Amino acid sequence: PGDQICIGYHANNSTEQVDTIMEKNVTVTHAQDILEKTHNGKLCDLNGVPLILRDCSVAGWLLGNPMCDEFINVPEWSYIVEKASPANDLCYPGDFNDYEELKHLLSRT
Amino acid sequence: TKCQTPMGAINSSMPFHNIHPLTIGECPKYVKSNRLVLATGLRNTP
Amino acid sequence: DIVLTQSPGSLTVSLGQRATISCRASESVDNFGKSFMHWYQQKPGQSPKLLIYRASNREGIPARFNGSGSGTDFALTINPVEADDVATYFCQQSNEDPRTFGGGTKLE
Amino acid sequence: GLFGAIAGFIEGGWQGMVDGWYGYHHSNEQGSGYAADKESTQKAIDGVTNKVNSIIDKMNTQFEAVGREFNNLERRIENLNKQMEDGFLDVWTYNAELLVLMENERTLDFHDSNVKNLYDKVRLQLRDNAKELGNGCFEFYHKCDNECMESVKNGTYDYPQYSEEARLNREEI
Amino acid sequence: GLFGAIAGFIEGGWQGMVDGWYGYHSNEQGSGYAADKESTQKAIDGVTNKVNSIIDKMNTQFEAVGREFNNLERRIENLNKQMEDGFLDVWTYNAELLVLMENERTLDFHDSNVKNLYDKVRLQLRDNAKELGNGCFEFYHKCDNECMESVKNGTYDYPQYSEEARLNREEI
Amino acid sequence: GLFGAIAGFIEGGWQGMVDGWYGYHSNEQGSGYAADKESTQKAIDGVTNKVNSIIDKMNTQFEAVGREFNNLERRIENLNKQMEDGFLDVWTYNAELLVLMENERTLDFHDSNVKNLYDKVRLQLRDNAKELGNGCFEFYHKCDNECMESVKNGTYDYPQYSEEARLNREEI
Ligand SMILES: *[C@@H]1O[C@H](CO)[C@@H](O[C@@H]2O[C@H](CO)[C@@H](O[C@@H]3O[C@H](CO)[C@@H](O)[C@H](O)[C@@H]3O)[C@H](O)[C@H]2NC(C)=O)[C@H](O)[C@H]1NC(C)=O
């Protein structure tokens, strides 16, 4: 019978859910995802600049394993990529002293 | 890419990622979550 | 198109001196903070050779080659000039397709 | 929620109001319609936006893992290094997860509070010139044309102007 | 507290209500306590999820490991110790603070549930009852046990009692 | 703010009240400001304990130690640096965030104390006064200085003024 005014709040067709301390899966009108979960599954160039060792190890590269001729004169790199257990390491068996300390120096280069 | 990981490169503006901890370049901060979503709107009614 | 114009066209320099070849880009070739210019050497009678990438860093290239410049103009400096430096030198930009080269500069 | 408005004494939101988060539905002789309270909506937008931006800001000095290599006789510092990296990764994951959970809860209650304040803003203006229906609606004891509706919405209700015609309508009731 | 109800406008709790946290009467048929099952269960669910969430967030906590070092490894020994104490101190802070913060919110949460319950009744009764101002509403009409039950389960028929209420207000 | 009082329905603070944070009159005997000592002291205690609790929770914070390493200890040097910066960054976050979070709660805490104070008076006065809607209640009866003092210390005798109030309401 009489004029009226109502206070109320927004609602929509959103299905986005959100979590809190007291409650889980709370459907909400608007939410922001802040976690990136996808990558291109590829090794790529970094800002127009990597040295990919393929089947060579850093030792093999620096000492000059004949099976590592690809890297006789390598250009500037952004980062370096090495396989877990490269085949072409020290072709003649032996040791590389303070090798890890040498890889570290590389990583600053 | 502007951000690289041993599993692949990242093209994102998210502040967080869960791809791999060891990255190089301008990267989101790595975290072990499967999900990080902030409520911005309000509780929706069914 | 980013028109690249090298100067001078031909340069004769005394042995053991300094060759100074210039490059000038119509628009800049210079974002991400780096210059995307490259210098190439074509010794007579054979394919071109890579000297400098992104305008300043040498590719097995002797230090006699000084890559310098930023933005719209650059310069390849050969000093000291040796005997086996007779060639035509090219600058080429990668900042923006279509990849464009300089006219080229012949050194005597 | 914490303040009793959203899903509280106002049982439900309006699909119909679309130009904002909080607002009014009026109903007079000239006709009915939804309208958003621009002021309280903008305040909330600013608050939530600053909140989101503050959360992302506080995280710029977060830990960044670095590749480091060790040999077979460096297993101890290898493990120390791993524990250190996982250590910080676990801390910062907790910090991000918890911060989001905590501020989400505050955000929902923030909206609840903005609504309850909006209702109170109208109520404190209308006083005895209208009846609290108890569902977010006030039934007027006088004639409220569109311009009158607009005065309630922008906080310029002239209570005494309608005071007499309201009082008379209350008393035949 | 934050919402003015618990130890506020309702000055004191009832030893007498024992089947819940929040609840309610006094008519001709007699008086008695009763818990609001709905608001109580909501609070129980909220607090229980809260407790379970706190314990959950702590599963990826630091775990100290025994490590041994010799007389010429004093530096990394100390580094290792600082690292362990470092994380132990961080996680102790995190547990202590989380408990302090959520305790405060929990007390105010109860305060809020109560204030909402009071408002739930108030918004139903309107002018059909008088706000005594202590958590009690004095009715302007007859409220039998079934009427009491309608207020408690949110099905109060305001207009049904509207007339007998209005008449009782006006001889006053 | 969260509770609608400070910069809300009470639009502005009083430069004039100086002996406290929250407080109150205008009658025939004259007008003046006065602080509610009780609610003010409660807030002072709350904020002071809060400040002291924040400073207390930080006593087990990380403390960096000078450590030296040689050219063939670059790895543990770097590990040590990352560890130190690591904790320094964590504790800086913890201090910054704690301050930001508790600041927000503090402002809303004051808002809540005010809204409670207003409600304390409102629930006493009931229909013996009119809610102006700006933090002020216009009385339906004569309130001398002693009456003003009863409202301020929570001893308002509602029924004593009930009749003269009711009569003044009804000629209106
Ligand atoms: C919010 O709701 C979602 C959707 O229900 C929840 O995720 C779902 O969780 C259930 C377990 O309760 C998952 O079921 C699982 O599926 C695997 C598939 O291999 C199977 O082994 C079993 O059937 C197992 O129970 C379901 O897959 C999953 N759905 C999605 C889309 O992830 C989630 O748990 C809820 N969040 C909270 C906080 O409760």
Swiss-Prot record, chain D:
This is Hemagglutinin HA2 chain. The chain holds residues 347 to 519 of 568 of the full protein. It comes from Influenza A virus (strain A/Goose/Guangdong/1/1996 H5N1 genotype Gs/Gd). Glycans are attached at N154. Disulfide bonds join C144-C148.
